[PDB]
Design a protein around this nucleic acid. Structure first.
Ligand code: NA
Ligand code: NA
Ligand code: NA
Ligand code: NA
Length: 326
DNA sequence: CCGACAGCGCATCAGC
DNA sequence: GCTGATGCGG
DNA sequence: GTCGG
């Protein structure tokens, strides 16, 4: 990837515009438009000279080219400058960094004078359970997880799961499975041969991880998906590890490997895999792969017993997760 | 000109 | 009390 | 905001 000094001013500006569209204007599609522009620019290996040069990239349109011309001539953007100083919009944008506080909650809080983390602390009875946990671990949740800690976390999850029932299958996916040096959370996919698409499995695993005090908190928990908080144990007289976000999902055995593939990513790798998949006559989603008949009617799901089976169906050589950046 | 931009589990709200 | 809608997350 | 039918 190009140095963050080639167009980092431009991609910083676009990412900031994206966050205000998401959190303040509640315009999720303008959020993704700015994000998409930021991404294609951050990959461009030339220092951008003008808005017209940028407009050649896909995702950069007329209005962003204009914003780039203004940023290149002035070193800022008038609209961005204004909204930064705006006490209301800046507080709304900020409160959404609390897990569980989205745009609507952030708006409501700011409306009634709740603007800062301190303000949230004095108003616990106005916070639901998830938001109390997001507040409690605000700084921890913004920290990244080095791969070494991820391995130690995986060690615990694989051990305790096998201890519950040795026939469980558990896979830590996400960027950690592709080889990344750091992670933002832990995403665990869980299955069991007793659970197919036509037939307490999760609770028992969550309970054991709480019993050994790995999982410390619960944001949500149902029969197929758990989202919560965990923390590695600290070495006697040394600094305690930050609390971390961990999700665990129970997925039917016959849909497991589609799930593992999908939740390994990367996002762009999935798109061209689906994009390759349909041109060969197959429809891949998170759950299943199916054949697309002459009219476009997808038939029944095809049996899948490993990731490679999916690659086999669509005439694609198996690519290792470390080669799934795209 | 103008619709798509993913779609789903869980917590909680809005309505009845 | 239940059913469906919405907010939120990743 | 951008793409494209
Ligand atoms: Na363009
Ligand atoms: Na956020
Ligand atoms: Na949030
Ligand atoms: Na056993």
């Amino acid at each position: 990837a190009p140095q963050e000094t080639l167009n980092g001013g431009i991609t910083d500006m676009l990412t900031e515009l994206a966050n205000f569209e998401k959190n303040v204007s509640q315009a999720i599609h303008k959020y993704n438009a700015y994000r998409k522009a930021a991404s294609v620019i951050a990959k461009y290996p030339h220092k951008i000279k003008s808005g017209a040069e940028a407009k050649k990239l896909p995702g950069v349109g007329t209005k962003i080219a204009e914003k780039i011309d203004e940023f290149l001539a002035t070193g800022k953007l008038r609209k961005l400058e204004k909204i930064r100083q705006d006490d209301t919009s800046s507080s709304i944008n900020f409160l959404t960094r609390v897990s569980g506080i989205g745009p609507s909650a952030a708006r409501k809080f700011v409306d009634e004078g709740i603007k800062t983390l301190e303000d949230l602390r004095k108003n616990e009875d106005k916070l639901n359970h998830h938001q109390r946990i997001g507040l409690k671990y605000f700084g921890d949740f913004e920290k990244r997880i080095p791969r070494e800690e991820m391995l130690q976390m995986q060690d615990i999850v694989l051990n305790e799961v096998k201890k519950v029932d040795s026939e469980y299958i558990a896979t830590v996916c996400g960027s950690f499975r592709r080889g990344a040096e750091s992670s933002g959370d832990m995403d665990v996919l869980l299955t069991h041969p007793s659970f197919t698409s036509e037939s307490k499995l999760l609770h028992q695993v969550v309970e054991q991880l709480q019993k050994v005090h790995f999982i410390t908190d619960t944001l949500s928990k149902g029969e197929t998906k758990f989202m919560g908080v965990c923390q590695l144990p600290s070495k006697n007289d040394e600094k305690e590890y930050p609390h971390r976000r961990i999700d665990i999902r129970l997925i039917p055995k016959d849909q497991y490997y589609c799930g593992v593939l999908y939740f390994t990513g990367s996002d762009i790798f999935n798109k061209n895999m689906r994009a390759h998949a349909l041109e060969k006559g197959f429809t891949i989603n998170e759950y299943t792969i199916r054949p697309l008949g002459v009219t476009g009617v997808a038939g029944e799901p095809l049996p899948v017993d490993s990731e490679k089976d999916i690659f086999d169906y669509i005439q694609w050589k198996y690519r290792e997760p470390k080669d799934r950046s795209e």
